[PDB]
């Protein structure tokens, strides 16, 4: 239809899924909000729509050692629901 995107000064981004017009590509990484495809997600963040690469999770590194062990000293009772 008659509607047009500016295609200039609108922060055109190139993805493996296609051409995304109207969203700025940041270099940060957030949890997926709106799946675009090929590892790209989109979200509404501060008054604009931004596109990023989704992050699998928080980085961690178990301190593996040669003769070292870790033992808990407390516990928690957790109740979760399944539908």
């Amino acid at each position: 239809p008659t509607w047009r995107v500016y295609s200039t000064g609108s922060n055109v981004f190139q993805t493996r899924a296609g051409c995304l017009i109207g969203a700025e590509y940041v270099n940060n990484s957030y949890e997926c909000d709106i799946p675009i495809g090929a590892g790209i997600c989109a979200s509404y963040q501060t008054q604009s729509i931004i596109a990023y690469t989704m992050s699998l999770g928080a980085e961690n590194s178990v301190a593996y050692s040669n003769n070292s062990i870790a033992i808990p000293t407390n516990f928690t009772i957790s109740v979760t629901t399944e539908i």
């Binding site: 003769n67 070292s68 062990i69 870790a70 033992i71 808990p72 000293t73 407390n74 516990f75 928690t76 009772i77 957790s78 109740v79 979760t80 629901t81 399944e82 539908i83």
Partner: protein
Amino acid sequence: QKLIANQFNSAIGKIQDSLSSTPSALGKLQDVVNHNAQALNTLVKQLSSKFGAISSVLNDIFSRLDPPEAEVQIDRLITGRLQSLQTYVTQQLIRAAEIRASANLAATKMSECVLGQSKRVDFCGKGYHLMSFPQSAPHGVVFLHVTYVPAQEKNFTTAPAICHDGKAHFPREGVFVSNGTHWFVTQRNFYEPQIITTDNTFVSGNCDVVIGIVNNTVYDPLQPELDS
């Protein structure tokens, strides 16, 4: 006991709030309702299609046309509507198969999580399963899984065996640990150190095959009282 009863009750009190505040917590059950209504609206709404005919009204076709030319016009309508019902019934059979699979899983979870204690990982909750409670929901069921989760871990130095009198001792149901100066034997899932005696350890072999053995003393309960 008193602390454990408190933790359980606080956990229960948050479930009443969690489902109430979160809107899409029951999205799975609302999907059953929506798909059924959307199919029936599509079946009803598909009655206005001409399917190539002059109109979508049978009475108008018969009153305005001669019989032999009316049959041609209504044949498209009858064939078009028979196709709609066949497609609707076919989709229902596919949906009913998906529901039956979920019903079979719910019956299994009832027998295993609710009627017993389960050793299968992540089958009944995230953590070590304790027990479960059922609740009835429209066109479904809801399970409350109670699980035991460790917290507040500590660093320790460990050894596979302890050497004493030229014999290698292994723990019976625990693990050897040390805070830096002394050696204890403790259960794996909870820190409760105890002195290494001949009651909670068993001897097997000598003191050179094991890679990582450690010199220590293995207390003998029989000896000290005998000397009294």
